[PDB]
Amino acid sequence: TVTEQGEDITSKKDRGVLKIVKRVGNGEETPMIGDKVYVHYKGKLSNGKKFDSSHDRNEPFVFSLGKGQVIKAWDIGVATMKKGEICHLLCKPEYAYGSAGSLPKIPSNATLFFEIELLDFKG
Numbered sequence: 238t239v240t241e242q243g244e245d246i247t248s249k250k251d252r253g254v255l256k257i258v259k260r261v262g263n264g265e266e267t268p269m270i271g272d273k274v275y276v277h278y279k280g281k282l283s284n285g286k287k288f289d290s291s292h293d294r295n296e297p298f299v300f301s302l303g304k305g306q307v308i309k310a311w312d313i314g315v316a317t318m319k320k321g322e323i324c325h326l327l328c329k330p331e332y333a334y335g336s337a338g339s340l341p342k343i344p345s346n347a348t349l350f351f352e353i354e355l356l357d358f359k360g
């Protein structure tokens with residue numbers, strides 16, 4: 238299910254998380270549930286404003302995949318990636334911070350736009 242804004246990678250095919258591959262990984266497997274995943278990312282709002290980036294801290298963001306440690310769009314999206322891959326993820330609010338948002342950085346009803354690089358993962 239490939240739209241003009243990317244591939245719908247949701248289980249519901251509700252257009253809530255859309256993915257565009259920017260660089261193919263040479264890795265073969267995706268990370269598994271419970272793996273410790275290492276990424277770099279940059280997040281922007283629909284107005285182009287960068288709200289956060291791991292690159293700006295000069296160390297990776299680390300989380301356990303599929304454990305609800307991150308927004309739903311990330312547990313869905315990162316699970317599709319291979320080592321070395323860079324993707325863009327368009328994350329509708331229902332897969333992110335919803336109607337409330339998370340002020341000051343994330344407004345109400347915000348679609349989030351991430352560029353994510355899967356650096357490594359360990360089981």
Ligand SMILES: COc1ccc(OCCN2C[C@H]([C@@H](O)CO)[C@H]3CCC[C@@H](C2=O)N3S(=O)(=O)c2cc(Cl)cc(Cl)c2)cc1OC
Nearest residue numbers: 280288289298305306307308309311333334339342343349
């Ligand atoms: C199970 O549901 C959730 C779990 C976690 C959650 O937010 C906290 C984790 N988080 C914040 C990180 C980092 O800022 C933590 O140091 C970051 C990267 C991973 C995705 C997402 C993110 O999911 N965010 S974020 O870039 O969207 C973000 C950055 C900033 Cl500065 C502030 C916020 Cl509120 C979000 C939000 C969740 O539901 C709304």
